[PDB]
Amino acid sequence: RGGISYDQLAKLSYEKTLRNLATQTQNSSKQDKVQKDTKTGKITIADDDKLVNKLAVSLQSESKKRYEARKRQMQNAKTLYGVESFINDKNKQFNEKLSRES
Amino acid sequence: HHIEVVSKQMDPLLPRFVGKKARKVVAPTENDEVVPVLHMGEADPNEW
């Protein structure tokens, strides 16, 4: 209906991040190698310090957002359902799982 | 300098293997290479 296998989901996420990235590129347009040693086969690839910092910031930011949204579902989740008796939080959470099982 | 190796007879009363003492060890796993693990639901969960 319904669930999605772990592949299709992976693809969808890939596309989503592609769009986000392309938006960084457009907004950046609006505001405006391979060396392998002979001694060892160790490969080295020249890097732009920019876009690496931007990458780290992107990952951290998205992690923050996910953590926060899940946290809001934490908050509402416990405050919404007051019907049945409960001894502790963990009980109420379990019985909401029983609401998911219906 | 070559060498010559010769065993020494232990005093039968004294412990032979003076250093053997039961002790426990955690071994490392030295991983040289990776073995690729190469294999060839949606509505299913509603069943399962």
Place this chain on the structure above:
Amino acid sequence: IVNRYEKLLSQRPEWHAPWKLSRVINGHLGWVRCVAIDPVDNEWFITGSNDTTMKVWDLATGKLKTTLAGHVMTVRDVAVSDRHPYLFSVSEDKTVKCWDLEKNQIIRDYYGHLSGVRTVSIHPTLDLIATAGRDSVIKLWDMRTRIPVITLVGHKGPINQVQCTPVDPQVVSSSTDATVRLWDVVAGKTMKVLTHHKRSVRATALHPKEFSVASACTDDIRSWGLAEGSLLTNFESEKTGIINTLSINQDDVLFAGGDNGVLSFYDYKSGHKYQSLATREMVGSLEGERSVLCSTFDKTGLRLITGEADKSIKIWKQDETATKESEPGLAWNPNLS
């Protein structure tokens, strides 16, 4: 990749004959876990049980010769020796017990498994035992002095099925980490790893001739060349899950027992499935109890012996009419993978 698909349409493999049900033998109180056959005279069975016993059945008439007690818990595996008149049985009680066929009394107990030992296989020429089980290690036992000579560190989970071979790799092993290792025992480390299985490999069988092995999984029964360790072939299987056991006739027929009760017969060369059967459960049994726990062929290979979870042993005979009139099975149509 189509070139391969043409090369599947040239061969038109290997006709064989169907199988049918000769005989039903009740008489176990519990399930039948394991079956092995006298390697010399073909005159009898040794069948484990879930009742701890072992009941030695006569192959000719099916009568019950003797009872071998002495395990406290269920008997997962039984193996009979060629050059020796010995019978090595092994159970969930953490013990590998020898049996002297002559006088029918336990001779030796081998010690030092951490937990239940689910496979014994008797190395052909060395007077060794190979045992394995939930230990997640393979123990090479010296038959004479009861010394666990070699221990093979190895699979990351329990070890279901173990076999022995005279040349290199002398031990093949199959585990619930979904791998199959080909062992080099003298140095004591893996010679080759075969990962192509996607789930627990619950059964193997050695082809009596070509020096290869047939490995099993839930839905896909593969084959493997030993020595180099290549894949050889595949076997066409829709969901048969689960495959409890395999057996290889000397005619290159590859049996597959199901947990759905279906008996999936194959040709070994091709991968083609020429027959699938369905056993009748039993008088008072449950449709869940219909499955095939173990199986074997005699020395000849013209009969099949399958212990079933319904507390019965069944003997499947190969039809003598057959030929080309109507044998033909599914007739070699293969879908793209």
